[PDB]
């Protein structure tokens, strides 16, 4: 099983866990833990029933980190060690910092200097971009920076909206990626992936391999009863196989080109029967029939539909009103697609930099409490969405998926943030409707500024500071 892999890479698996949780730590300190864990494992191979060996492999990791001589004082995390094992795991999670400018620029030494610079990335990923980093003659950064962004974006969602929206996300994700799948199958594969994100986000490295491998087992076991593009991925070795399936393209779709949720007369009953399944089923069926849409849109629609029935199943002749839920989608969808086209012309009528400067002003205008480097970063992640996939088929399926990531960054990953009462309302309200929430924000009315007085980053920093300074002015002035 995977159980072998975890013991084989224990050196790495410990390094990552530590490095992420405590980014401020040295490599000297990493070796100290590595030995304790290695020796600990051998004692668990020296006795099957040893009291320390009935313990879970992360609440061992964090107990040693805390036990380690004056380490919590030297990296300000003593308050995490003064908590019960569960509260301590959550604390250690809150301890992980995303804005890592306080560190210097730049296997075991690499995994240290990645993990502590990329703390929220999943273990499977890092270990894959070690095997997929073991080169011979002198790129890959592109892949890692992307895989962090979606993992942070979900572990964001999980924190703020609990363990319900993450399901809906991964129904829309997997149903769109694997249309040939069946509901009862996929819904199980989701309550695996959802239960995986519980441990991967919290930072439980060891589980994030177990539950990740369990998920890839769950796919490959129904290989040609799910997909036909990941055939050579299931022949790859842990955890390449993990990131192979994830990195692959969406399945070719069946011969079927639905209206049970609209046409039927007992929709309220099937909704009242078991809501979250009924909705889960609606997101399943609508997703697999729309592989040219965004993940945020496939939730916006499901939410809108949940709102439609909520207003419908409380009136004489229910169906009459939810008859054209189908048409109400093709409306709100085509509006959103055309709205992407309106900003993909602003791109042509400015270019990378020209648009970059537009957003930075805007992004700062609405959220000027943020850091200049924080606001700068988003401005490049935002323009990356338009850089690629904003002049081709499914240009909406991307720019929406990709722009949504930059608001998760803004709203924070592992903290309930206080930016301004409006940006806060866009973050801590609804996951689906945060992009349109942000799109509808004017200048931060309530803001009291402080004093002030590469080249591309330098330019941006200047603009963001210039905007923060002259915040009482308008978009066209500052340009
Ligand atoms: C990080 O840890 C250090 C050491 O525990 C903290 O420094 C102490 O601060 C308290 C009150 O702020 C004083 O009573 C101690 O005398 C300080 N000791 C030393 C050696 O400085 C520091 O406050 C912690 N930083 C944060 C942000 O919590
Ligand atoms: C719509 C475009 O996204 C099409 N896209 C353009 C190339 N992308 C750029 C990007 O990610 O926007 C980088 C490589 N890409 C990354 C990935 O998806 O895993 C793999 C191939 N993808 C699979 C997919 O899209 O699901 C389709 C090709
Ligand atoms: C497919 C995997 O790559 C999973 N993926 C990992 C991160 N990706 C990296 C990248 O896309 O290059 C970006 C996210 N993605 C953007 C897009 O696909 O255009 C939307 C959400 N997807 C849904 C899906 O398309 O399966 C799940 C997240
Ligand atoms: C009637 C429409 O407004 C339905 N609406 C469509 C999109 N909205 C736009 C908006 O908020 O007017 C944003 C989503 N919305 C945010 C919010 O309302 O705070 C959460 C869900 N709401 C719940 C409600 O408030 O009835 C219904 C969704
Ligand atoms: C953030 O708020 C949500 C809901 O209000 C809550 O579930 C979550 O635990 C909070 N996270 C914190 C305080 O870190
Ligand atoms: C929604 O729009 C798509 C794309 O043009 C179209 O193929 C589909 O038939 C439309 N659906 C409805 C119900 O009008
Ligand atoms: Gd002991
Ligand atoms: Gd993706
Ligand atoms: Gd792609």
Numbering used by the authors: 13 to 118, 138 to 169, 187 to 305, 309 to 504, 521 to 546
Give passages from the manuscript.
Afamin is a human plasma glycoprotein and a member of the albumin gene family that has been reported to be a multifunctional transporter of hydrophobic molecules such as vitamin E and a potential binding partner for Wnt signalling proteins. The structural similarity of afamin to hSA suggests that afamin might also be able to transport cargo in the bloodstream.
Tissue-specific transport by afamin could greatly enhance the resolution of MRI imaging in blood-flow studies. As no crystal structure of albumin with a contrast agent is yet available, we selected gadoteridol (Gd-DO3A), which is used in medical applications as an MRI contrast agent and in crystallography as a lanthanide phasing compound. We were able to identify likely Gd-binding sites in a similar orthorhombic, low-resolution electron-density map of afamin by co-crystallization with Gd-DO3A. An even more dramatic cell contraction dominated by a further 6 Å contraction in a compared with the isomorphous ortho­rhombic dehydrated crystals and an almost 13% decrease from the monoclinic cell volume occurs in the orthorhombic afamin–Gd-DO3A complex crystals. Whether this decrease in cell volume is mediated by the single Gd-DO3A molecule located at a crystal contact or is a result of shifting local charge distributions owing to the lower crystallization pH of 5.5 versus 6.5 for native afamin remains unknown. After a few rounds of rebuilding it became clear that large parts of the protein had become severely disordered in the Gd-DO3A co-crystals, and owing to streaking and discontinuity in many parts of the map the model could not be completed. Subsequent occupancy refinement indicated Gd occupancies of between 0.9 and 0.7. The protrusions in the large density blobs and difference density suggested additional features around the Gd atom, but we were unable to determine and refine the orientation of the DO3A ‘crown’ around the Gd-DO3A. The validation report for the Gd model states an automatically extracted resolution limit of 2.69 Å.
